[PDB]
C-alpha cells in the first residue's frame, strides 16, 4: 500500500489529499486523448503547450504547502 | 511469517505441486480457473524450477487464477511467490 502512491492514512492532511487528486487529474488529461483535445480547443494552444504546461503544474498545484 | 515476496512479475509460468494443485492462489479456491500465473525467476529458480509456489515440493501442474480475483485485478500485483519470513530455502 505505502509504495503505492496516493495511499492515505488517518493523519492525511487536507492539502496532501487535494494535491494528489490534482496530479491524478493530470495523468488522466495527458492520458485521454480527447479530453486533452478538448482543453486545447477551449484555450487556444498546441496540444503540446498544453501537455507542457500541465507538466509544469504537476508539482505545484494549489501552490506551496502549509 | 508467511506473506508474499511481491517481486516483479516475470514471464515464468507458475508451478504447483500435488497438494496445492487446484487452488486459485489468492482466493484459495478451485472455482473457475481462467488465466495464468507468472512469477519472478528470482522467486522461481533452480531447485525452485517446477517447485511449489506454496509448500516446497515439485510442481506437477500450473495454477490457474480465478475469475473472482480477475475482475478485482489482483493477479497483476507483485509475483505471488509466498515467502516464509525466514528465507525461501
Amino acid at each position: 500500500q505505502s509504495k503505492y502512491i496516493g495511499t492515505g492514512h488517518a493523519d492525511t492532511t487536507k492539502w496532501e489529499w487535494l494535491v494528489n487528486q490534482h496530479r491524478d487529474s493530470y495523468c488522466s488529461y495527458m492520458g485521454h486523448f480527447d479530453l486533452l483535445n478538448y482543453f486545447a480547443i477551449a484555450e487556444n494552444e498546441s496540444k503540446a503547450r498544453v501537455r507542457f504546461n500541465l507538466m509544469e503544474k504537476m508539482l505545484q498545484p494549489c501552490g506551496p504547502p502549509a | 511469517d508467511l506473506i508474499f515476496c511481491r517481486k516483479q512479475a516475470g514471464v515464468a509460468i507458475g508451478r504447483l505441486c500435488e497438494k496445492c494443485d487446484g487452488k486459485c492462489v489468492i482466493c484459495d479456491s478451485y472455482v473457475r480457473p481462467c488465466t495464468l500465473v507468472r512469477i519472478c525467476d528470482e522467486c522461481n529458480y533452480g531447485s525452485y524450477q517446477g517447485r511449489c509456489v506454496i509448500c516446497g515440493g515439485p510442481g506437477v501442474s500450473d495454477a490457474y487464477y480465478c475469475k473472482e480475483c480477475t475482475i478485482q485485478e489482483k493477479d497483476r500485483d507483485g509475483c505471488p511467490k509466498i515467502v516464509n519470513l525466514g528465507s525461501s530455502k
Binding site: Q1, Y4, G6, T7, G8, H9, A10, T12, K14, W15, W17, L18, Q21, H22, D24, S25, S28, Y29, G31, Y38, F39, I41, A42, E43, P61, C62, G63, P64, A66 | D1, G22, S29, V31, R32, D41, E42, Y45, G46, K67, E68, I71, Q72, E73, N84, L85, G86, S87, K89
Partner: protein
C-alpha cells in the same frame, strides 16, 4: 536405563563433540590520504582497531556524497559520546579543505582474553621447555553467583580443617571410618510444584518453591514464570499463557525477559520442543519490541546462531527468520557495532556461525548498506582470521541471497579478488570457493564481472596439490556455463585433462567436485561427442561407480545427475548399456541407484534408441530387481512404469512374463509386498490395454475383484487403485466384472476408517457414478448417499474433495430435491458435522440441475430456529453464487430480502457470512444492470464497517471491494467522503482503509468523483480545467 530408553525416544542430543563448546558460552583528497594519517591518529587515541578505521574512510569513494549517516554508524561503533566530537571535526576539515583546493570496553576485554591465552600457553611453552579447573578469585566468585547471597565463615578452625581437607583428603582418605544405623512425630513436607517441574529445572524455577505475596520488580520476575506454563504443561496452558506474555511485551520490557529466558534457551538439558517453543517466544516478542532490544542483541545471537548449524532443517529456517527479525528489528549500526569482535574470536566455530549471521542481517538490510563494512574487512591487514571470515561472509551471502545477488556482483567480486593471491592458504581457499558460489547464483550471467578473476584461477589450477586445488575447480566448473564456447571452448579443452588425471583421488570432497564439473564441462553444447566417448567414460564408470559412493546420500544424487547428462549427449544405449548389468548386483541402495538413473534417462532421451538384445537385458533386469524389494519404495516402481510407457509396443512380447510375476507375487509372500504388485498393475494398465491383450484384462478384472475382501488396508488400497486405472482404459460396458457386480461390492467398504482405502474407494465410486451411472438401479444409490454423508468426518482434504464432487455426480443421476433434502439433514445442534463441505454439496448440487429449481426449499429452510444451520444456509448461497456466476442475474431478488434479515443482526456470524454472499454475488452479476438492488443491500451492509473481529472485518473488506466493482466507485465514494476527516481517530482509521481499497483499483476513474472543493488563502483546490466551456 529403560526410563533412559523411553525418555530418550523422547527428544535426543544430535550433536557432535565440536558443536558442544555451546555449553561454554557465558551470557553476553590526497590529503584524504595524509588525512588517513590524521583519522588514524585521532581514533587510535580515542589502540590499533583496524576495520573500524576502514568503515570510516570507506565512505570515501562516493565522493561528495558522505553525510550524517557517518555519525550514525560510527556513532554506535565508538561510544556515541566521542562520536559528535570526531565526525564533527571531520566534516569541518572536509568542507574546508574541500574549498581551498561499552563497545570499546568489550573489545578491550577480547584483547585481554587472547593476551591471557598467550600468557598461559607460553607458560607451558617455557614450562614445556622446563582449563575449567583453573583456580578462582573472590572478585570473580561474586559475579558468577547472582545477587543475594552471603559468603560465610564457620571458623578458622572450621575453614582450617577445610584448609586441612585436601592434605587430609589423602591423609584421612587413608584412616579409619565406617557408618552404623540403629533400629528404632515427623513433619516438613518439601514443596515441589502450577504445572510441573522436572527435577533439574528446580534451579530455574526455585523461586516457585516459595509461597508469599507483598514482595515491585520482583513481582514481575516472579510473575514471569508464566514461562514454565510455556515450557511445560498442557497445550491449552501453553496457548493462553503465550498470548498473555505477548501483550505483556511492552510492559515488563525485554530486560527482565531475556534475563529470564536465555538461561533456558541455554539449558544443558533442553528438548527439541522446548527449544522450538522458546524460540517462538523470542520471535513473537520480537514482533513488538524494536528500539528496545538494542542492549540485548548480541546477548541474543549468542544463543541463536548455533541454530544456524543444526541437523534439523526446520530449525534453520526458524533461526534465519528470527535473526532477520532481530536485525531489521534492531538497527543496522546496532548490528555492526555489536558484531565485530566475534570476527577475530579464537574459535573458528564462532566465526563460522558469525558469518552466517552477517549473511542474514544482510538479507535484511540489503547488501549495499553493508558493503563498505565488508569491503573494509577483507582489507583488514591486522590478521587473516578476519579475512577468512569476511570472505566466508561473502559466501553465505551468496548462498542465501542467491539469484538476487546480481546487481552488486561486480562490487562483491571486487572485494574478493584480493584474496586469491594471498600468502596464507585458507584465505585462498575459501575465497575461490566463494567465487564458485557466486557464479552458481549468477546463472547464467555477469560473466565479465567475474572477469578479472580468471587468469589467476587458470594458472592456480596448474600448480596445486590438495583441497584448495579441487576447490578452484569447484569454481571454474561453475564458471564454464558462463563463457563463450569459443573462449569457453579453449579453456574447457584445457580443464578436461586435469579433470581426467583427477578422477582417481581418495578424497570425497574431491569426487563430489570433479563430478559436478563433468556435468558442466562435458555438460556443454560446444563440446564434441566422441571425445567424451573415448577419454572419459571408461574411467568414469570405472572409478566412480562403486559401492563407496551410493551408500552416502549426496553422492548418490549428484552422481545420478551427472550420468544423466552424459546420456543427454552421447546417447542412451551407451550409458544404459554399461549399467544394466548391475540391477542384478545384490545390495540394494546400489540397485536402487542404477534403477533410478535409467528411469530418468529413458525419461529424457526416449526409449527409441535402444537396441534389442540390450532390451531383453532390460526387462529381465527390471523384473529381477523388482522382485526383491527391501521396503516398498516409489523408486523401482516408478522407474519401471516409465520403462514401459517408454518402450510402448516394443514391450509386447514381454507381458506374459510380467503378468505372470504380477500374479505370483501378488499372492503370497505375505501381504506386505502385495500392495506393491498391485500398484505395478496400476501403472501398467495402459500398456495392457492398447496392445489389446484382453485375456489379461479378464485376469486382472476378476482376480483383483476377489482381493476386495482383503482385510489389510494397505493392500486393498493399492488394489482399488489398480481397479480405477483399469477402468480408465477399458470402458464401462466392456468391463469384465460388469459393473452391476462391482459397484455394490464396493459399497459397504466405505466404513473402512483407514485412509488409503477411503481415498481410492471414493475416487473409484466417483469415476463410475460419473461415467456409467446407469448400470446401477437408483435404490442402490440412495444407499450410497446415506453412506457418503459421514465421509465428511475426514481429517484430510482430498477425501472430502472428491467426496463432494461425487455427491454431485449421483445428484445428477437421480435429481435434486431429495439429495439436498437429504443434505439438508445436517443440523445446527451439532456443528463439526455439516461444518461446510455439506454446504458445498448444496452448492454443487444446486448447479447440477437448475438452481432455479432448488432455492425455495433452501430459503424456506432458513426459517428454522436452530442458529448454526441458519448460517449454514447463508454460506450455501455463498458458494452458490460463486459457482453460478452470470446466472445470478435472476435469483438475486430472491435472496436480497433474506440478506436483509440475516444481515441485520442476530449475531456477528450472520453479518459475516451473509456479507460474503454479497461479495460473490456482486462480482458474478457484473454489469448486467441489476445494481439497484445491490445498492439497496449496500445500506444494510454498511454499518458493519466497524469492528475488531478479524473475520468479520476481512469479510466486510471482501464485501465492499466486490461491491465497488458492481455499483462502481462513484456511489461508494459517496459513502466514503464524510469519513475521511471525521474528528475521531476510530472512524478515520477505517474510512481511510476503505477509501484506499477503493482507491487503488479504479484510480483512473475517480477523477470525475472528487467533488468541488473551495480554495483557501495559500492555495487553490478548485481544478479550473473542467469548466473550460467551448
Amino acid at each position: 536405563d529403560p526410563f533412559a530408553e523411553h525418555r530418550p525416544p523422547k527428544i535426543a542430543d544430535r550433536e557432535d563433540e565440536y558443536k558442544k563448546h555451546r555449553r561454554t558460552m557465558i551470557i553476553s583528497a590526497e590529503k584524504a590520504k595524509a588525512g588517513e594519517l590524521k583519522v588514524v591518529n585521532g581514533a587510535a587515541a580515542s589502540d590499533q582497531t583496524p576495520g573500524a578505521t576502514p568503515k570510516k574512510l570507506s565512505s570515501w569513494d562516493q565522493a561528495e556524497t558522505p553525510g550524517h549517516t557517518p555519525s550514525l554508524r560510527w556513532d554506535e561503533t565508538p561510544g556515541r559520546a566521542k562520536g559528535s566530537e570526531t565526525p564533527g571535526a571531520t566534516p569541518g576539515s572536509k568542507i574546508w579543505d574541500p574549498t581551498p583546493s561499552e563497545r570499546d570496553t568489550p573489545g578491550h576485554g577480547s584483547g585481554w582474553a587472547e593476551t591471557p591465552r598467550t600468557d598461559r600457553g607460553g607458560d607451558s611453552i617455557g614450562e614445556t621447555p622446563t582449563e575449567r579447573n583453573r583456580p578462582l578469585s573472590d572478585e570473580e566468585l561474586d559475579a558468577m553467583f547472582p545477587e543475594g547471597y552471603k559468603v560465610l565463615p564457620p571458623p578458622a578452625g572450621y575453614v582450617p580443617i577445610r584448609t586441612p581437607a585436601r592434605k587430609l583428603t589423602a591423609t584421612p582418605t587413608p584412616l579409619g571410618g565406617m557408618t552404623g544405623f540403629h533400629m528404632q512425630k515427623s513433619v516438613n513436607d518439601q514443596p515441589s510444584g502450577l504445572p510441573f517441574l522436572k527435577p533439574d529445572d528446580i534451579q530455574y524455577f526455585d523461586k516457585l518453591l516459595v509461597d508469599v505475596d507483598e514482595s515491585e520488580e520482583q513481582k514481575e520476575r516472579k510473575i514471569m514464570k508464566l514461562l514454565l506454563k510455556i515450557k511445560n504443561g498442557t497445550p491449552p496452558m501453553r496457548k493462553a499463557a503465550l498470548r498473555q506474555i505477548t501483550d505483556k511485551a511492552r510492559e515488563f520490557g525485554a530486560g527482565p525477559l531475556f534475563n529470564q529466558i536465555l538461561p533456558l534457551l541455554m539449558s544443558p538439558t533442553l528438548e527439541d520442543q522446548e527449544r522450538h517453543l522458546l524460540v517462538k517466544v523470542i520471535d513473537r516478542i520480537l514482533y513488538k519490541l524494536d528500539d528496545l532490544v538494542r542492549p540485548y542483541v548480541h546477548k541474543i545471537l549468542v544463543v541463536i546462531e548455533p541454530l544456524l548449524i543444526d541437523e534439523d532443517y526446520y530449525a534453520r529456517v526458524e533461526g534465519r527468520e528470527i535473526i532477520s527479525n532481530l536485525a531489521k528489528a534492531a538497527g543496522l549500526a546496532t548490528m555492526i557495532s555489536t558484531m565485530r569482535p566475534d570476527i577475530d574470536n579464537m574459535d573458528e566455530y564462532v566465526r563460522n556461525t558469525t558469518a552466517r549471521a552477517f549473511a542474514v542481517v544482510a538479507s535484511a538490510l540489503g547488501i549495499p548498506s553493508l558493503l563498505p563494512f565488508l569491503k573494509a574487512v577483507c582489507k583488514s591487514k591486522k590478521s587473516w582470521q578476519a579475512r577468512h571470515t569476511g570472505i566466508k561472509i561473502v559466501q553465505q551471502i551468496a548462498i542465501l541471497m542467491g539469484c538476487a545477488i546480481l546487481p552488486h556482483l561486480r562490487s562483491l567480486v571486487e572485494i574478493i579478488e584480493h584474496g586469491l593471491v594471498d600468502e596464507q592458504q585458507k584465505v585462498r581457499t575459501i575465497s575461490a570457493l566463494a567465487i564458485a558460489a557466486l557464479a552458481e547464483a549468477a546463472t547464467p550471467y555477469g560473466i565479465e564481472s567475474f572477469d578479472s578473476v580468471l587468469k589467476p584461477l587458470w594458472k592456480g589450477i596448474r600448480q596445486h596439490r590438495g583441497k584448495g586445488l579441487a576447490a578452484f575447480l569447484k569454481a571454474i566448473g561453475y564458471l564454464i556455463p558462463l563463457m563463450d564456447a569459443e573462449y569457453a571452448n579453449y579453456y574447457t579443452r584445457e580443464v578436461m585433462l586435469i579433470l581426467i588425471r583427477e578422477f582417481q583421488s581418495p578424497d570425497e570432497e574431491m569426487k563430489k567436485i570433479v563430478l559436478k564439473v563433468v556435468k558442466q564441462c562435458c555438460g556443454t553444447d560446444g563440446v564434441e561427442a566422441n571425445y567424451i566417448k573415448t577419454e572419459i567414460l571408461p574411467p568414469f564408470f570405472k572409478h566412480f561407480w562403486q559401492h563407496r559412493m551410493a551408500l552416502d546420500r549426496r553422492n548418490y544424487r549428484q552422481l545420478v545427475d551427472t550420468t544423466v547428462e552424459l546420456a543427454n549427449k552421447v546417447g542412451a544405449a551407451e550409458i544404459i548399456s554399461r549399467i544394466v548389468d548391475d540391477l542384478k548386483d545384490e545390495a540394494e541402495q546400489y540397485r536402487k541407484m542404477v534403477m533410478e538413473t535409467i528411469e530418468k534417462i529413458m525419461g529424457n532421451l526416449g526409449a527409441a534408441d535402444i537396441d534389442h538384445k540390450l532390451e531383453e537385458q532390460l526387462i529381465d533386469g527390471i523384473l529381477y530387481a523388482f522382485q526383491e524389494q527391501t521396503t516398498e519404495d516409489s523408486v523401482m516402481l516408478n522407474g519401471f512404469g516409465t520403462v514401459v510407457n517408454a518402450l510402448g509396443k516394443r514391450v509386447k512380447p514381454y507381458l506374459p512374463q510380467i503378468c505372470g510375476t504380477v500374479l505370483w507375487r501378488l499372492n503370497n509372500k505375505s501381504a506386505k509386498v502385495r500392495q506393491q504388485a498391485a500398484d505395478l498393475i496400476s501403472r501398467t494398465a495402459v500398456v495392457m490395454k492398447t496392445c489389446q491383450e484382453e485375456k489379461l484384462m479378464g485376469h486382472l478384472g476378476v482376480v483383483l475383484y476377489e482381493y476386495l475382501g482383503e482385510e489389510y488396508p494397505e493392500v486393498l488400497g493399492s488394489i482399488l487403485g489398480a481397479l480405477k486405472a483399469i477402468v480408465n482404459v477399458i470402458g464401462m460396458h466392456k468391463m469384465t466384472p460388469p459393473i452391476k457386480d462391482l459397484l455394490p461390492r464396493l459399497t459397504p467398504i466405505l466404513k473402512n476408517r483407514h485412509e488409503k482405502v477411503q481415498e481410492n474407494c471414493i475416487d473409484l465410486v466417483g469415476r463410475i457414478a460419473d461415467r456409467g451411472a446407469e448400470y446401477v438401479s437408483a435404490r442402490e444409490w440412495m444407499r450410497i448417499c446415506f453412506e457418503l454423508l459421514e465421509l465428511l468426518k475426514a481429517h484430510k482434504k482430498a477425501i472430502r474433495r472428491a467426496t463432494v464432487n461425487t455427491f454431485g455426480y449421483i445428484a445428477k443421476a437421480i435429481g435434486p430435491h431429495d439429495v439436498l433434502a437429504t443434505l439438508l439433514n445436517n443440523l445446527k445442534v451439532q456443528e463439526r458435522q455439516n461444518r461446510v463441505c455439506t454446504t458445498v454439496a448444496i452448492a454443487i448440487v444446486a448447479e447440477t440441475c437448475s438452481p432455479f429449481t432448488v432455492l425455495p426449499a433452501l430459503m424456506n429452510e432458513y426459517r428454522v430456529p436452530e442458529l448454526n444451520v441458519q448460517n449454514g444456509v447463508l454460506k450455501s448461497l455463498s458458494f452458490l453464487f460463486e459457482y453460478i456466476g452470470e446466472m445470478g442475474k435472476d435469483y438475486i431478488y430472491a435472496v436480497t430480502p433474506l440478506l436483509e434479515d440475516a444481515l441485520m443482526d442476530r449475531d456477528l456470524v450472520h453479518r459475516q457470512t451473509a456479507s460474503a454472499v454479497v461479495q460473490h454475488m456482486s462480482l458474478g452479476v457484473y454489469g448486467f444492470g441489476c445494481e439497484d438492488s445491490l445498492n439497496h443491500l449496500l445500506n444494510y451492509v454498511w454499518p458493519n464497517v466497524f469492528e475488531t473481529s478479524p473475520h468479520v472485518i476481512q469479510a466486510v473488506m471482501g464485501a465492499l471491494e466486490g461491491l465497488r466493482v458492481a455499483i462502481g466507485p462513484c456511489r461508494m465514494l459517496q459513502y466514503c467522503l464524510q469519513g475521511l476527516f471525521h474528528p475521531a481517530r476510530k472512524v478515520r482509521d477505517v474510512y481511510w482503509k476503505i477509501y484506499n481499497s477503493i482507491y487503488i483499483g479504479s484510480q483512473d476513474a475517480l477523477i470525475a468523483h472528487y467533488p468541488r472543493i473551495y480554495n483557501d488563502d495559500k492555495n487553490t483546490y478548485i481544478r479550473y480545467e473542467l469548466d473550460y466551456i467551448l
